[PDB]
Design an enzyme around this catalytic site. Structure first.
Site, PDB file in Angstrom:
ATOM      1  N   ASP A  86       0.832  -1.195   0.000  1.00 20.85           N
ATOM      2  CA  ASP A  86       0.000   0.000   0.000  1.00 20.85           C
ATOM      3  C   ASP A  86       0.870   1.250   0.000  1.00 20.85           C
ATOM      4  O   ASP A  86       1.699   1.444   0.892  1.00 20.85           O
ATOM      5  CB  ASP A  86      -0.919  -0.012   1.222  1.00 20.85           C
ATOM      6  CG  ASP A  86      -2.033   1.006   1.128  1.00 20.85           C
ATOM      7  OD1 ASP A  86      -2.998   0.767   0.371  1.00 20.85           O
ATOM      8  OD2 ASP A  86      -1.954   2.042   1.818  1.00 20.85           O
ATOM      9  N   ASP A 133      -8.719  -2.169   1.502  1.00 24.92           N
ATOM     10  CA  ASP A 133      -8.766  -1.588   0.164  1.00 24.92           C
ATOM     11  C   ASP A 133      -9.951  -2.128  -0.626  1.00 24.92           C
ATOM     12  O   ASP A 133     -10.657  -1.369  -1.303  1.00 24.92           O
ATOM     13  CB  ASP A 133      -7.462  -1.873  -0.580  1.00 24.92           C
ATOM     14  CG  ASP A 133      -6.351  -0.917  -0.198  1.00 24.92           C
ATOM     15  OD1 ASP A 133      -6.565  -0.080   0.703  1.00 24.92           O
ATOM     16  OD2 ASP A 133      -5.261  -1.001  -0.802  1.00 24.92           O
TER      17      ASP A 133
HETATM   18 MG   LIG Z   1      -4.877  -0.746  -5.677  1.00 24.20          MG
END
Ligand SMILES: [Mg+2]
Ligand SMILES: Nc1ncnc2c1ncn2[C@@H]1O[C@H](COP(=O)(O)OP(=O)(O)O)[C@@H](O)[C@H]1O
Ligand SMILES: Nc1ncnc2c1ncn2[C@@H]1O[C@H](COP(=O)(O)OP(=O)(O)O)[C@@H](O)[C@H]1O
Ligand SMILES: [Mg+2]
Lengths: 106, 540, 525, 49, 98
Positions: free
Chosen positions: B72, B403
């Site tokens: 991330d 996410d």
């Molecule tokens: Mg992504």
């Protein structure tokens, strides 16, 4: 004297004056034996607040009675010189009677 | 090129203007722009390797030596110990993209770096930075309009979740949890759809409990339509499983009552002592009887209780759990359909929650016990319970699932999608290039620079996958021009086709729009800074 | 100098006297002005200042930049003080004041060097400033029509002009419309505390919204809050200042009992007090409950069971804005919750705003307040957006107070310089040089605009001077067209009081700086 | 009485804007909701309210 | 200080509250209005009541001020409102006024 009246409404000049030289505390005093107040309602608190100044008000009233007895007119005056302090309540009570007072004298 | 000013007067007298001006440093003009662009380019070049399915991880170490392997971009930039102000601006940009969208936190940084590199070239050619910012703003407007034009709508219905599964899979493709790719996509989609408001309203993420425990396998991660609690049954001899449990949620300790106000109960005789002991015993008996009268099978308390209450609960066939946290109490009440009761006097049968199965779960040779409440009737709270071979992959799975949840939330907010793999970037660059031809000459350079900066995502994707960047991007752009098809992207996985619609590479439209917008405004803000005044004290 | 056995002042006292210290003061003022030069006009740039703590600040406003500078020069601090004064009284032009004062000092520096008496310079500045202020008052364009549409257009144009120098200049029309709409809802005093400004990270600038009501962040909800409905279609709002918790009745309250029955009665009495407060609130008919003081978990669950909304620890300003928007009264006691003390809004809702939860009160028809919600990619981004909106709000408020406008872009100062030169041509001559220097120094702003925009300053200034001498009051610098243009028809509008205050403050600062002949610095204690 | 003349310093508008007010000015706000009175009847208490 | 309950009940009865911290300002206000500083919460008698032509909240520059204004050109205490562009300039003007 190196000090003057502590009340704004107090007289600044007295023509004929009677002098009361005292060594009596005219301010609030706490009990020596740790009293404390106990109540159960707002009205009881008001009564206790009003009744806790009775001791000082008695001596203030004695001074007022002497003032009114000595001179029934507005010509003369009393200057009260106190070696001990005077709380604002007693100062206002004395001022309302036209008495100039001094606190914490040498 | 530092120290501000130093003249000491024309007459030799001291000339002190700013406090500690002899220890302060400043940068002015084009030099500050060049330094800012260099720092942003460095940050973006570091981040660009973690883009796409073939992107690689970054191993981040904090002050205390804790290690988090992650992909991330927002997390990577958050954990960096940066000192340059422009780097802090990039980190804030990533945090903003994470907050608003939750996905695409790495694309924004790369886009900003490419934009600032093109701006560096333009400045070296001699264009005012404000002109570059205005050109970038209008090119971003054109690109956003094109993205709106080429977008496609998808169904967000519970009956058919295939587009949602595809979008979640596209989001999770770049993460390490792709070994359980479809499973994680499905559990994320089901989690988001379960805790949601139908009329396109918001999705409250605190109704989703994401908890991870070491051991097991990543495939063992499952979606639990209930609540998972770290606590267990209070008495060791209490049964470990309750069927068709009627929950009794309470927020009062099973102890004798205690007033909040300062109180003193005076005992003045033996009769007073006997009355006090009888009062305590009867209070315990009556609270147990009040709990039992409602017909409840399980008792959940928040503030714990003492030995007499524990043994009375065991003796009355009432399994109980103590010291449950407030959020967990709320989640249990929501899922089981019961009401939070503040004291036993107000407990009724109508306030009892229902759980199909309440079970205590072991985790091997660890002595650790965790409580499972599931099989609710119409549970409006969900729990994601993650297993793994080490805590690091557990944290990575946590953020990857976050996410995915954010992506499905964005889809619920707005169901329009565009096809990723750099296809959207290529189409936007083509639209910007077409618009630049009609534009006057002066802003045309800014438009072309914006298009070139947009083209960095397909090149990064191709390079990360080992293909030649320039040749692949040029071929895909030529194919997009020759036949009307904005869905042609970079075949990162080498599936044999460039059509991302067939490959099911789907991204939220609002995610792309936010990427472009945030990159544009951050680039403008950086370009508008022409002066730095650092303390230069080198403080410890 | 001879060492006295007993020195007069304490050792370490520094004294500078005469022309050299005045020249040094002028140079210090130039140094301070140089730090804010490039932040002028639509082509201006931003400055980044890092403190000792490492928290950087990025600003285009002159007053903020000067305040963040630790200026210790006694003469230089006057520029910071007058910039703060201009920000306080007007709110815009904090760069113009410093530029004008420094230009005045630079222009009179050669005359100071050659021994000209400073009182003459001070008198010349006072005369020129009075003439310039009178000219501004005379030539300021005002319209005696008293209609809403053109007044609103004037306000929007002034807000756009005040906004076309910052990072939000691309969305200047949108933000100016928002600012004008926000200001028009203030009732009579235009208090700044009635315009809320919330900064929410993440999102485009165009995502910023103005709510015709009040909005504030969620404030530490307790357990059971998630069971409360988060949308109401005609709620009644119970604005409160009440601690809805189980607690001691008073800090100095002691309960003395000698019976278990009395113990149970006391516990039930505490519970009954709490439930009596809650029941009075519920029977008041309200659906949304807000309080300055904390609202406990018991009260939260009680309100959840009644399908009601509660929020504790709401800030004072937020409840004040809510009261102004809905029309209730903040009650410290719940004994008399009549219908007239309850607020009323059309729609109340809790929504997700960029990673945060915000409570929205909309649909208030009698609202006297508003709340800006600003979106941006960085903390300093939103801070500078807030500063720009504050400048626009101040300009719009001043225009509401009095709508007298002059063309910007240096047109007003070019006209003033022409008038001052014409006046100086008709005076004996000792004042003539100083008044001419004042008029020449008035030309700094268009020159700085041209320099920041990258033009050729000399040719543009020559064209402007020729145009003003030939005729045309409102011809200023046209930034986009690389030339000059009529700035009144180009809607470069600024209130006349901005220039009036700028000239007055700059003149006062220059006179104060010139009037000093000695600087004495006692050793630090 | 010299002390009967009070000076209030407010920044912003140049010394030419100074004025004389027959009364007093306190750089402070008001506690309550009411902000303006047209026929004031001030009652002064030296004790806390 | 002002209690919350007292403030609420004063707001209920449309009473303006001013809290002067310094006793000197309180005495000066008593002189300029004509009231007596009571030591209790007793209602004021007719003689002790203070009177003023207008009391209001206003903003000058960027400072919130409370103004006790007399319409007549008379009173025990008169105040001078000094404006300026610098604190030091206003201090010098104050010295000149003194
Ligand atoms: Mg992504
Ligand atoms: N299966 C795929 N084929 C081609 N490109 C992909 C695929 N999956 C993701 N991408 C691209 O990789 C880019 C990076 O995505 P990812 O690393 O998941 O998040 P971020 O956008 O934050 O870097 C996205 O812009 C997307 O277009
Ligand atoms: N569109 C424009 N064209 C030309 N000049 C402008 C324009 N907008 C603002 N200006 C000028 O820029 C000057 C600086 O204004 P601004 O930077 O907004 O605040 P400050 O006066 O505090 O620097 C103003 O005097 C104004 O006349
Ligand atoms: Mg401005």
């Amino acid at each position: 004297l190196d000090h003057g009246a502590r009340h704004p409404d107090m007289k600044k000049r007295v023509e004929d004056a009677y002098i009361l030289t005292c060594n009596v505390s005219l301010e609030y005093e706490k009990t020596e034996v740790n009293s404390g107040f106990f109540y159960k309602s707002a009205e009881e608190r008001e009564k206790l607040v009003k009744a806790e100044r009775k001791f000082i008000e008695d001596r203030v009233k004695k001074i007022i009675e002497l003032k009114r007895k000595v001179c029934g007119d507005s010509d003369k005056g009393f200057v009260v010189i106190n070696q001990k302090g005077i709380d604002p309540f007693s100062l206002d009570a004395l001022s309302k009677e036209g008495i100039v007072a001094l606190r914490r004298a040498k | 090129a530092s120290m501000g000013t130093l003249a000491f007067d024309e007459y030799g007298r001291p000339f002190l203007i700013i406090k500690d001006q002899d220890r302060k440093s400043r940068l002015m003009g084009l030099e500050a722009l060049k330094s800012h662009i260099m720092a942003a380019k460095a940050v973006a070049n570091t981040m660009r390797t973690s883009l796409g399915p073939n992107g690689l991880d970054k191993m981040m170490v904090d002050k205390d030596g804790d290690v988090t392997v992650t992909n991330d971009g927002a997390t990577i930039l958050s954990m960096m110990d940066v000192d340059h102000q422009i780097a802090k601006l990039m980190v804030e940009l990533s945090k903003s993209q994470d907050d608003e969208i939750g996905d695409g936190t790495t694309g924004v940084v790369v886009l900003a770096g490419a934009l600032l590199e093109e701006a560096e070239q333009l400045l070296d050619r001699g264009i005012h930075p404000i002109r570059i910012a205005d050109g970038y703003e209008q090119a971003a407007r054109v690109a956003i309009e094109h993205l709106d034009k080429i977008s496609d709508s998808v169904l967000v219905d519970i009956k058919d979740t295939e587009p949602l599964i595809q979008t979640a899979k596209t989001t999770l493709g770049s993460k390490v949890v792709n070994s359980c790719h479809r499973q994680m996509a499905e559990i994320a989609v089901n989690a988001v759809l379960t805790v949601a408001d139908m009329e396109r309203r918001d999705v409250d993420f605190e109704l989703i409990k994401v908890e991870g425990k070491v051991g097991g396998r990543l495939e063992d991660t499952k979606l639990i339509k209930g609540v998972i609690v770290d606590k267990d049954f209070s008495h060791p001899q209490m049964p470990k499983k309750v069927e068709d449990a009627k929950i009794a949620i309470l927020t009062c300790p099973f102890e004798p009552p205690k007033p909040k106000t300062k109180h003193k109960l005076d005992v003045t005789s033996v009769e007073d002592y006997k009355a006090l002991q009888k009062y305590e015993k009867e209070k315990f008996e009556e609270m147990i009887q009040q709990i039992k009268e409602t017909g409840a099978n399980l008792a959940i308390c928040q503030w714990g209780f003492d030995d007499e209450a524990n043994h009375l609960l065991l003796q009355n066939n009432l399994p109980a759990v103590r010291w449950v946290g407030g959020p967990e109490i709320e989640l249990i009440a929501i899922a089981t359909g019961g009401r939070i009761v503040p004291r036993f006097s107000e407990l009724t049968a109508e306030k009892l929650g229902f759980a199909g199965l309440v079970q205590e779960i072991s985790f091997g040779t660890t002595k650790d016990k965790m409580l499972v409440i599931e099989q609710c009737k119409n549970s409006r709270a969900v729990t994601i319970f993650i297993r793994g071979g080490n805590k690091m992959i557990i944290e990575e799975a946590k953020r990857s699932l976050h996410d995915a949840l954010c992506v499905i939330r964005n889809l619920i907010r707005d169901n329009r999608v565009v096809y990723g793999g750099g296809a959207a970037e290529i189409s936007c660059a083509l639209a910007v290039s077409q618009e630049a031809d009609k534009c006057p000459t002066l802003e045309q350079y800014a438009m072309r620079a914006f298009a070139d900066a947009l083209e960095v995502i397909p090149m990064a994707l191709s390079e990360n996958s080992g293909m030649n960047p320039i040749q692949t991007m040029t071929e895909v752009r030529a194919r997009q021009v020759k036949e009307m098809n904005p869905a042609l992207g970079i075949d990162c996985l080498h599936k044999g086709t460039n059509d991302m619609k067939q490959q099911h590479v789907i991204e939220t439209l609002i995610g792309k729009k936010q990427q472009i917008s945030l990159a544009t405004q951050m680039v403008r803000m950086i370009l508008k800074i022409d002066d730095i005044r650092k303390p230069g004290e080198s403080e410890e | 100098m001879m060492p006295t056995p007993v020195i007069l002042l304490k050792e370490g006292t520094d004294s500078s006297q005469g022309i050299p210290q005045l020249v040094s003061n002028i140079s210090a003022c130039q140094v301070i002005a140089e730090a804010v030069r490039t932040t002028l006009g639509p082509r201006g740039m931003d400055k980044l200042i890092v403190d000792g703590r490492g928290k950087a600040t990025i600003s285009n406003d002159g007053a903020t930049i000067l305040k963040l500078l630790d200026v210790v020069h006694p003469a230089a601090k006057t520029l910071v003080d007058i910039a703060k004064s201009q920000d306080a009284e007007v709110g815009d032009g904090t760069t113009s004041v410093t530029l004008l004062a420094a230009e005045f000092l630079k222009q009179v520096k050669p005359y100071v060097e050659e021994g000209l008496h400073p009182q003459i310079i001070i008198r010349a500045f006072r005369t020129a400033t009075q003439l310039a202020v009178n000219k501004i008052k005379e030539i300021a364009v005002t319209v005696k029509k008293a209609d809403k549409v053109e007044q609103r257009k004037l306000l929007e144009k002034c807000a756009m002009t005040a906004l076309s120098s910052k990072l939000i200049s691309q969305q200047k029309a949108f933000f100016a419309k928002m600012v004008v709409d926000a200001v028009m809802m203030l009732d009579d005093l235009l208090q700044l505390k009635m315009i809320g400004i919330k900064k929410v990270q993440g999102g485009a600038l165009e995502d910023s919204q103005l709510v015709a009501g009040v909005a504030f962040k969620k404030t530490f909800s307790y357990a059971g809050f998630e069971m409360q409905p988060k949308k109401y279609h005609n709620p009644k709002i119970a604005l409160l200042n009440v601690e809805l918790e189980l607690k001691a009745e008073k800090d100095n309250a002691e309960i003395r009992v000698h019976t278990v029955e009395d113990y149970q009665a006391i516990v039930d009495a505490e519970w009954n007090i709490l439930y009596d407060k809650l029941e009075k609130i519920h029977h008041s008919g309200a659906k949304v409950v807000l309080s300055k003081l904390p609202i406990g978990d018991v009260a939260t669950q009680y309100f959840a069971d009644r399908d009601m909304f509660c929020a504790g620890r709401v800030p004072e300003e937020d409840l004040k804005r809510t009261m102004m928007a809905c029309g209730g009264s903040i009650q410290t006691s719940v004994n008399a919750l009549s219908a007239d003390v309850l607020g009323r809004c059309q729609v109340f809702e809790e929504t997700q705003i960029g990673g945060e939860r915000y409570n929205f009160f909309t649909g208030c028809p009698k609202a006297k307040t508003c709340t800006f919600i600003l979106r941006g990619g960085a903390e300093q981004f939103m801070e500078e957006t807030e500063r720009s909106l504050h400048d626009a709000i101040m300009i719009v408020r001043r225009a509401i107070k009095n709508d007298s406008v002059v063309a910007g872009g240096g047109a007003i100062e070019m006209e003033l310089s022409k008038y001052l030169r014409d006046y100086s041509r008709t005076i004996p001559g000792k004042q003539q040089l100083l008044i001419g220097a004042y008029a020449k120094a008035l030309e700094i702003i268009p020159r700085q605009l041209c320099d920041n925009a990258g033009f050729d300053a000399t040719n543009i200034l020559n064209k402007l001077r020729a145009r003003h001498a030939q005729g045309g009051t409102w011809y200023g610098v046209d930034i986009n067209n690389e030339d000059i243009a009529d700035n009144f028809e180009a809607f470069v509008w600024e209130p006349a009081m901005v220039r009036i205050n700028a000239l007055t403050a700059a003149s006062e600062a220059a006179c104060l700086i010139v009037s000093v002949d000695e600087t004495i610095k006692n050793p630090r204690s | 009485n010299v002390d009967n003349i009070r000076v209030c310093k407010i920044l912003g508008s140049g010394i030419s804007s100074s004025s004389v007010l027959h009364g007093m000015v306190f750089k402070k706000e008001t506690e309550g909701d009411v902000t303006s009175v047209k026929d004031a009847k001030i009652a002064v208490y030296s004790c806390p309210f | 200080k002002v209690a919350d309950m007292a403030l609420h009940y004063a707001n209920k009865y449309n009473i303006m509250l001013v809290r002067l911290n310094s006793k000197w300002d309180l005495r000066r206000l008593c002189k300029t209005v004509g009231a007596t500083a009571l030591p209790r919460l007793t209602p004021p008698v007719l003689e002790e009541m203070g009177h003023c032509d207008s009391v209001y909240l206003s903003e000058v520059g960027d400072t919130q001020v409370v103004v006790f204004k007399h319409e007549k050109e008379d009173g025990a205490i008169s105040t001078i409102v000094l404006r300026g562009s610098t604190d030091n300039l206003m201090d010098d003007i104050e010295r000149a006024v003194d």
